């Protein structure tokens, strides 16, 4: 139905929101500290001296273990 298409799109967008905002390939699993923006995978997060959302300096990256994580 049309609703099938609508829900497919909703699901796709929710899944994409859980993917790294830089590489668009890997799940978000990293927090820039202290600002708290949690928008990257570990690989992209390691390479950024400044937060890509707010431009605050990254003191360190905290790995986050989220219930949504998949493999
Ligand atoms: Zn990434
Ligand atoms: Zn930030
Ligand atoms: Zn724990």
Spatial contact of 65 and 31, defined as CB atoms under 8 Å apart: no
Tell me the CA–centroid distance for residue 41 and ligand 2, in Å: 14
Which residue, among 17, 59, 22, 56, has the nearest Cα to 42 in the 3D structure? 22
Ion ligand 1 residues within 5 Å by Cβ: 20, 22-23, 26, 41, 44
Q: Indicate if the alpha-carbon torsion angle 61, 25, 54, 12 is positive or negative.
A: negative
Tell me the CA–centroid distance for residue 13 and ligand 2, in Å: 22
Distance separating alpha carbons of residues 62 and 38, to the nearest angstrom: 9
Distance separating alpha carbons of residues 42 and 65, to the nearest angstrom: 12
Tell me the CA–centroid distance for residue 66 and ligand 2, in Å: 19
Which residue, among 69, 71, 9, has the nearest Cα to 38 in the 3D structure? 69
**Which experiment gave this structure?**
X-ray
Which option is the CATH number for 2-63: 3.30.40.10, 3.30.300.30, 3.40.50.300, 1.10.1370.30? Answer: 3.30.40.10
Distance separating alpha carbons of residues 42 and 13, to the nearest angstrom: 21
The SS3 of residue 62 is strand
**Residue whose structure tokens are 């699993």:** 29
Give me the resolution in angstroms, 1 decimal. Answer: 1.1
């Amino acid at each position: 139905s049309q609703q099938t298409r609508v829900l497919q799109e909703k699901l796709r967008k929710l899944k994409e929101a859980m993917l790294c905002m830089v590489c668009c390939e890997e799940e978000i699993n990293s927090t820039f500290c202290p600002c708290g923006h949690t928008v990257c995978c570990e690989s992209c997060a390691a390479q950024l001296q400044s937060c890509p959302v707010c431009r605050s300096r990254v003191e360190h990256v905290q790995h986050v273990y989220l219930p949504t994580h998949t493999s």
